[PDB]
């Protein structure tokens, strides 16, 4: 597209907004930028010629714009943006700008949880094929930074927020991995509204990869000829268990024993299936995509086995900051002895009820900590202990573990009551797992 001579205003001075600034500067357009934070991090990366306004939005800048480029972190519903749209001012986001310029096929991945794992996995499948693939859309590598005429394939992780401002995406393959109660703040009309944002990803997609086990991932008008499904018990791509073994199965044919993979957990096996369905639909060779499933290490803090010693697996699932993540970790969970389950932190007023139906059984112990520990111990008081901190809980369980056991940090809560971020929490869990379980 051609932006010469336009009055362009960018909202957000994070990495995403900075990538938008770079995009317009590379095209000879000097945009204006604003951020409601007084001193956003990106401020001191800006060139001198870019006018900037911080500490709030600048309504007259917005109302004079030819094009508003909104960070995903501000709502289309914010009064200033509603006022601009009422005036007929075009509002887009960075993904919309990307889609207008992308000259290679796009694989597009959204969902409440698992996006980063599936996105990275599809990227590995492309790399195994020798494809110069560009992988991004997370806050840490914004899509506009991927744009390059040498790129042969784009793999984008897309949030519901980015999708709300995107209209030009024509994915060669797209998925909604799952939809669970999250981002409730931004979706005042509930789960079907949050869903409608994610459903935009299928607009003009050539192939829709849907979750057979989550009907909210189906396209808005229902299943159609574009749809390929992945699931646990059935679907085009599904899981097969027998003789104590598990296989990935595609259209009636086993394709891989999961013992060749390095990921653990049924939900990561379904992530593998979704990734393979997307890669297949994108035209990547099956052989190299299966090879990627055997080399993919997984991402830190996502159901990550950090220690396996003396028959005890220690699993860092610190990135399970919400209930749907932990529920997925407990569903179909394979443990031969006792599960020692670490829950706690700032639960953000979540309903933890869903976790209850997994915590019966003679082989479960709960260790609950942080701000909301008491709520979590309430799930099943008989098998629960409550401490202030994760380290205290780990010291409580470490002398009790036996071969066959699993120690799972799947907190279902944010970490900010006691840690700088979930990465520090996961890193601390790994340090203590090795201190207490390695020797
Ligand atoms: N298919 C899945 N369903 C539910 N939870 C999952 C699934 N795959 C992974 N998880 C868990 O969800 C948490 C987040 O994983 P991941 O970082 O891949 O998600 P995401 O969608 O990228 O998240 P974000 O919205 O923060 O970008 C981790 O606990 C991971 O184990
Ligand atoms: Ca802002
Ligand atoms: Ca206590
Ligand atoms: Ca956190
Ligand atoms: Mg001024
Ligand atoms: Mg999210
Ligand atoms: Mg992510
Ligand atoms: Mg079902």
Swiss-Prot record:
Transmembrane segments: none annotated. The keyword Cell wall biogenesis/degradation applies. GO terms for cellular component: cytoplasm. It comes from the Bacteria. Keywords: ATP-binding, Cell cycle, Cell division, Cell shape, Cell wall biogenesis/degradation, Cytoplasm, Ligase, Nucleotide-binding, Peptidoglycan synthesis. It is found in: Cytoplasm. It catalyses: UDP-N-acetyl-alpha-D-muramoyl-L-alanine + D-glutamate + ATP = UDP-N-acetyl-alpha-D-muramoyl-L-alanyl-D-glutamate + ADP + phosphate + H(+). Its main location: cytoplasm. InterPro entries: Mur-like_cat_sf, Mur_ligase_C, Mur_ligase_C_dom_sf, Mur_ligase_cen, MurD. GO terms for biological process: cell division; cell wall organization; peptidoglycan biosynthetic process; regulation of cell shape. ATP binds at residues 111-117. GO terms for molecular function: ATP binding; identical protein binding; UDP-N-acetylmuramoylalanine-D-glutamate ligase activity. Pfam families: Mur_ligase_C, Mur_ligase_M, MurD-like_N. Its cofactor is Mg(2+). Pathway: Cell wall biogenesis; peptidoglycan biosynthesis. Gene3D superfamilies: Mur ligase, C-terminal domain (3.90.190.20), Mur-like, catalytic domain (3.40.1190.10), NAD(P)-binding Rossmann-like Domain (3.40.50.720). The keyword Ligase applies. Coiled coil: none annotated. Optimum pH is 9.0. Its EC number is 6.3.2.9. Cell wall formation. Catalyzes the addition of glutamate to the nucleotide precursor UDP-N-acetylmuramoyl-L-alanine (UMA). Belongs to the MurCDEF family. This is UDP-N-acetylmuramoylalanine--D-glutamate ligase. It comes from Escherichia coli (strain K12). The lineage of its organism: Bacteria, Pseudomonadati, Pseudomonadota, Gammaproteobacteria, Enterobacterales.
